[PDB]
């Protein structure tokens, strides 16, 4: 067995192995890549998403979120709540200010130390899940916007057609801006490039332990996991590396700087934070190993996760026994 011991595995491909994204996930995954639930992949030295990002100022962020955290440092919730429209210039501006701007440090490790020591103390603005694109249209090579869509390949997979769209989305950061302990929605893999700025730390737990992350969170959120049988679906919750060592969670920790791909396997569970003023562009996508993973998903049917649109079809079509349930949820 590849990768035994789950490690995040980077990767260097050829321009030439960059020309065909299915059959490099394909490769990674000989390699035991998805063993780790998250990969790296530094793109080849030829290759680049857009020529400048210098235009990109008056892109906006329609509802930022400011995300307000509840707890200790080590094990705390956040909620978000809704600030007025901003420019990406104006939001750029507002991160590099003195309240919200990356403090002095010597490291990542030192940022890392005080992004846990320090995170519930502070409530950072996020612009998330922006539909949208900055690749440019000519970039052939690992352009989110123009990948193979999830719809397609259940059709490749299953033989069925189904309504649905799989678009990017932006996402503009700040210091301690925090992405939640997740997987995807259906368990999907995602793929997510840092366009610019400053770096993103992730945190993973290998697919086959992701019960031990499940176990862990309903003992650290009894009310939530009361409420909802799966309410890290609602994305709201946070476990620091310190408390996961403590209680025996099997996970690995790395940085994505500018410039460099992740990819996120099904059922890899992942949470992590914004260094300063950054901008990444992600999407859903699948594979045929992915298939076996969406059937098998856990479901938000509290109402509390509400998911787009196409999430609907892969309830129906994977999950009929779970569909009338979770969509009772979703009205
Ligand atoms: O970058 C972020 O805030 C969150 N991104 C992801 O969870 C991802 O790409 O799967
Ligand atoms: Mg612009
Ligand atoms: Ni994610
Ligand atoms: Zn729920």
Redesign the pocket.
Known sequence: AQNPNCNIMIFHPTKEEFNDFDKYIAYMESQGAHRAGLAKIIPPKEWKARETYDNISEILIATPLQQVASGRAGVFTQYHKKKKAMTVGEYRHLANSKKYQTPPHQNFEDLERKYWKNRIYNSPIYG?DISGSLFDENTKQWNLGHLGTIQDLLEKECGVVIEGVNTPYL?F?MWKTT?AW?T?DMDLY?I?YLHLGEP?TWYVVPPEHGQRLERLARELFPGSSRGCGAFLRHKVALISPTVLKENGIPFNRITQEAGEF?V?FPYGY?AGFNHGFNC?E?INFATPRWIDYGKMASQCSCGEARVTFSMDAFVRILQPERYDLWKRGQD
């Open positions: 998330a996402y950061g992405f997740h995807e995602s997510n993103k992740m996120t992942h990444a992600a």
